């Protein structure tokens, strides 16, 4: 395995851990805030993904400091990951156009 491919793999593993830990902690931050809805694990899990993907429907979102601090980590994980895959694909493609020119 080439590095770009390892780091994407690493980032996909690490993204999943962030999505799960994120779900757990979002519920743990958000319970105790009256009106908070991000307060059960299953939909937390859905929230974490709609967050890391930057889709962000807003059906759900945090309203407490630590919710928001957890949310900011999920986003960054999301964006970094979905930009290391791109960087990896860009390096795979560049490699293949180098061979198709003889280099």
């Amino acid at each position, epitope marked *: 395995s080439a590095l770009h491919w390892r780091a994407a793999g690493a980032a996909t593993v690490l993204l999943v851990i962030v999505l799960l830990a994120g779900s*757990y902690l979002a*519920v743990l931050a958000e*319970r105790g805030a*009256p*009106g*908070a*809805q991000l*307060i*059960t*694990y299953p939909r937390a899990l859905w929230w974490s993904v709609v967050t890391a993907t930057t889709v962000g429907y807003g059906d759900l979102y945090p309203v407490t400091l630590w919710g928001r601090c957890v949310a900011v980590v999920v986003m960054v994980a999301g964006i970094t990951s979905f930009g290391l895959v791109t960087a990896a694909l860009a390096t795979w493609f560049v490699g293949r156009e180098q061979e198709r020119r003889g280099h």
Partner: antibody
Amino acid sequence: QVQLQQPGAELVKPGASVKLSCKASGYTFTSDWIHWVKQRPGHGLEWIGEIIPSYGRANYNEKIQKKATLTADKSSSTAFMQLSSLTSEDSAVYYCARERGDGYFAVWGAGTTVTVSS
Amino acid sequence: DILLTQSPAILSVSPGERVSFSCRASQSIGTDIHWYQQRTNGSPRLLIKYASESISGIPSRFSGSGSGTDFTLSINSVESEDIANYYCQQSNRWPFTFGSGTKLEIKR
């Protein structure tokens, strides 16, 4: 196998305090919340508070006076609720109940009848 | 804090007849309503979760229905064992809240 095990009764002198136990058997998870629910005679169910024994965080009913303080013993699988400086208002049955963090109370204890008198 | 309203408080039905209990949320809670039975001197017992879903253990005689603000627990053909106090309970917004409750009462 009875999952939530609670004392039948505690007598308490007005002004005094009391620690209610709730020993849990069956599947435990990290995810699990223990809840406490107050029922005065001929009245209905009131949500007091919740604790997650794994991380030890608890939350309580703002909407009522904050008599209670919640604790767990990770090792002995027990939740405690500490009701302090009681009066006859506080004379009720206190149920504990297990919620998997998915919103419903799947299982309840038999509750503890707490009587505040001299 | 979401307000659960159970009218009527008492429900008089005849043996084997269909009965429905109403639970209205002060604001849309989706399907995040749960129904409990409490007989005299008993602890609460989950009948229905997320408005409609069966609990295994519970008679098929029990169903729920509803979305947003209007919810409904129904018993097709009531019998004596059904005599108890019914409560609804929301999980949609912190903190969880309960219905004031409704008494099922059979005229025999």
